[PDB]
């Protein structure tokens, strides 16, 4: 017979189980030097782990802040997505449903909340994401106040995991970078490097009928464990296949983001999530919008380039040949009424594209 991911054997033979430190691979790194200097130099192709909140510009309730607070912030009729892991399948119930379950003492079950979302609560003026994800990311720099479709609704989730509690590798949609802050208890992260054969794999383990019975790390040479706990910070890089171990009742805080560093990395992300076509909780929405918006933004800069003579940067230049490529691709005849949804108003794909093609030749002649 085959383990089945999640369940309880699982849990054991995985807590039992060695795995490299992320010692060779994860930064720890002072709140106050996470600056857009340090990103740059270093291009974000690791996780960052920050010790202790001083200087990130987290704001997050004091750790006395618990689960029935959530209750009461979030609300208790809210409907959640809940994630049964010893059967590896999700449902739905009220919040407050899921409360009761959790201060319950007779727990069979183990069961999490890992994508409430309560930008749209009154738990939301509780929890800022630090300050150097509103510099990278996109959404926060480029998409309008008063845009016509709505912002990617994936800034400020709640986790709450009981003790047991497993995630599966994943890649978190449209290879978006995240934000990880343990309010208490902690979490294991197991991290993989998204080498171009680890994604490969990756994207054919997931399609494969018996997932669920295959542990992704015997496949990978290094699969890294990463404890984050209470109070620490964790930045996961664009494209970075990682699950996690919750190994007491945990709280935590998280966000999701895109930035001009992995504009690679993030198209790779969602072409693999394109063809796989599983979708589920953390799904990133109008990651194309966020694209489009983007663009729009580098065409700006190349025009304003000249005004200061000042070249744009060649991450920045590649970044936007990439995204022209992927803008190609969303609009020729026979790509979709799906890709015409997520365009923003006033835009003009065939001249924005025409345009950025001038202005990345423009550039590269220098």
């Known amino acids: 017979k085959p383990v089945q991911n999640g369940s309880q054997l699982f849990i054991k033979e995985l807590r039992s189980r060695t795995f490299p430190s992320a010692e060779d691979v994860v930064a720890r790194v002072p709140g106050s030097q996470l600056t857009l200097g340090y990103m740059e130099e270093h ?34 009729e809210r409907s959640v997505d809940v994630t049964d892991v010893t059967k590896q399948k999700d449902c739905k119930m009220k919040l407050k449903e899921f ?59 709640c986790l709450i995991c009981v003790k047991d509690s497993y995630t599966d590798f994943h890649i978190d949609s449209g290879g978006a970078s995240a934000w990880y802050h343990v309010l208490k208890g902690e979490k294991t992260f197991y991290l993989i ?22 542990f992704f790390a015997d496949q990978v040479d290094k699969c890294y464990k990463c404890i ?26 998280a966000g999701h983001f895109l930035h001009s560093l992995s504009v690679e990395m993030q198209m790779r992300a969602y072409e693999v999530e394109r063809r796989l076509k599983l979708g589920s909780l953390t799904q990133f929405p109008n990651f194309e919008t966020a694209c489009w918006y ?58 924005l594209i025409k345009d950025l093609a001038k202005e990345i030749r423009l550039s590269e002649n220098a």
């Open 43 to 76: 291009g974000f192709t690791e996780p960052i782990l920050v010790p202790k909140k001083d200087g990130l510009g987290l704001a997050v309730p004091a750790p006395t802040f618990y689960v029935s607070d959530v209750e009461n912030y979030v609300g208790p």
């Open 99 to 157: 409360v009761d379950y959790y201060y319950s003492t007779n727990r069979k079950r183990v069961l999490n909340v890992t994508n409430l979302e309560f930008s749209d609560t009154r738990m939301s003026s509780f929890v800022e994401p630090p300050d150097i994800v509103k510099k990278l990311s996109w959404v926060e720099n480029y998409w309008p106040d008063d845009a016509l479709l709505a912002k990617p609704k994936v800034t400020k989730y």
């Open 193 to 214: 490097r998204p080498a171009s054969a680890n994604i490969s794999l990756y994207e054919r383990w997931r399609s494969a009928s018996n997932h669920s019975e295959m």
């Open 228 to 253: 984050v706990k209470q109070g620490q910070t964790l930045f996961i890089p664009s494209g970075w296949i990682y699950a996690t171990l919750t190994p007491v009742d945990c709280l935590a805080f």
């Open 294 to 351: 983007m663009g729009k933004h580098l065409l700006e800069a190349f025009k304003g380039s000249h005004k200061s003579g000042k070249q744009l940067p060649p991450h920045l230049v590649q970044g936007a040949k990439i995204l022209n490529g992927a803008f190609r691709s969303w609009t020729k005849k026979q790509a979709l009424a799906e890709h015409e949804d997520e365009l923003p108003e006033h835009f003009k794909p065939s001249q």
